[PDB]
Amino acid sequence: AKALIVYGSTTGNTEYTAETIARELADAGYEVDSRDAASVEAGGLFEGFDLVLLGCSTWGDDSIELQDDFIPLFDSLEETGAQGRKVACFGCGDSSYEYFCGAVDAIEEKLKNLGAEIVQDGLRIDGDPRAARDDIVGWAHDVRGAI
Ligand SMILES: Cc1cc2nc3c(=O)[nH]c(=O)nc-3n(C[C@@H](O)[C@@H](O)[C@H](O)COP(=O)(O)O)c2cc1C
């Protein structure tokens, strides 16, 4: 199978996560196309993938904001065809906050209402993804034995 990894990272956390996740896949027999959202384009993007990996960090204090690079993709997500698509969402945040990884929640929601089938519960990392690296290896892993 063929997977798409699209990520929004500001400080490099979600970028790290998507890489760990990328290999996760690739070492398993997976063909993987990883991309920065900063550059993606919504026009049938999801097209011809068996799984879509959609990542993003949270910003904001009062209001939930999505990693910046990712917003314009968030905005035009019904243009990508996530109909009966297989999508799992991930990102980084800090639980010191009230709407911890609230960016994972919104992603997942527009996905549903859109058509995707979420194969698994979003992976919400609290901290440097790097020290949770195992939590990560297992999630990539649970989404495989899931399709
Ligand atoms: C201005 C700001 C507000 C944040 N907003 C929240 C929050 O609402 N939810 C939470 O999960 N993460 C929140 N975080 C921090 C995480 O989003 C951020 O540290 C994270 O690691 C993103 O890594 P990245 O560079 O891949 O986007 C806050 C941190 C700061 C700087």
From Swiss-Prot:
<keyword id="KW-0288">FMN</keyword>
<dbReference type="GO" id="GO:0009055">
    <property type="term" value="F:electron transfer activity"/>
</dbReference>
<dbReference type="InterPro" id="IPR001094">
    <property type="entry name" value="Flavdoxin-like"/>
</dbReference>
<comment type="similarity">
    <text>Belongs to the flavodoxin family.</text>
</comment>
<feature type="domain" description="Flavodoxin-like">
    <location>
        <begin position="3"/>
        <end position="144"/>
    </location>
</feature>
<dbReference type="InterPro" id="IPR010087">
    <property type="entry name" value="Flav_short"/>
</dbReference>
<keyword id="KW-0285">Flavoprotein</keyword>
<comment type="function">
    <text>Low-potential electron donor to a number of redox enzymes.</text>
</comment>
<dbReference type="InterPro" id="IPR050619">
    <property type="entry name" value="Flavodoxin"/>
</dbReference>
<dbReference type="InterPro" id="IPR029039">
    <property type="entry name" value="Flavoprotein-like_sf"/>
</dbReference>
<keyword id="KW-0813">Transport</keyword>
<keyword id="KW-0249">Electron transport</keyword>
<protein>
    <recommendedName>
        <fullName>Flavodoxin</fullName>
    </recommendedName>
</protein>
<dbReference type="GO" id="GO:0010181">
    <property type="term" value="F:FMN binding"/>
</dbReference>
<dbReference type="Pfam" id="PF00258">
    <property type="entry name" value="Flavodoxin_1"/>
</dbReference>
<dbReference type="InterPro" id="IPR001226">
    <property type="entry name" value="Flavodoxin_CS"/>
</dbReference>
<dbReference type="InterPro" id="IPR008254">
    <property type="entry name" value="Flavodoxin/NO_synth"/>
</dbReference>
